[PDB]
Amino acid sequence: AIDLCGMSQDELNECKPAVSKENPTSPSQPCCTALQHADFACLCGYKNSPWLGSFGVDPELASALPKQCGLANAPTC
Numbered sequence: 001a002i003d004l005c006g007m008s009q010d011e012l013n014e015c016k017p018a019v020s021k022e023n024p025t026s027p028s029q030p031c032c033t034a035l036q037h038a039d040f041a042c043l044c045g046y047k048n049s050p051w052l053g054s055f056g057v058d059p060e061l062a063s064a065l066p067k068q069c070g071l072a073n074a075p076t077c
C-alpha cells in the first residue's frame, strides 16, 4: 500500500479509465471523491514519468480530470 500525492493504489486504479489514452470513460464517483484529497501540484510532478506511457495515461485528460469532477481547483500542468 502506497500514498502517491494523496491517492492510494486503489484510487489511482479507480481513476485510470478516466485518463486512458485509449477509450477513456467518464470519471466514476469514487474517482472524483478521492481527488478531493489529492495533491495536484504533487501529481503534476509526474507529468513526464515513464509510468504514463506504461499505464496508457493521457497527460491532457489527466490535466482535465479535476474540472470533469466539478472540483473548483485545477492542475496547473
Ligand SMILES: [Zn+2]
Residues within 6 Å of the ligand: 001, 002
Ligand atoms: Zn504498502
Ligand SMILES: [Zn+2]
Residues within 6 Å of the ligand: 006, 007, 008, 011, 034, 037
Ligand atoms: Zn484516498
Ligand SMILES: [Zn+2]
Residues within 6 Å of the ligand: 011, 033, 034, 037
Ligand atoms: Zn480517498
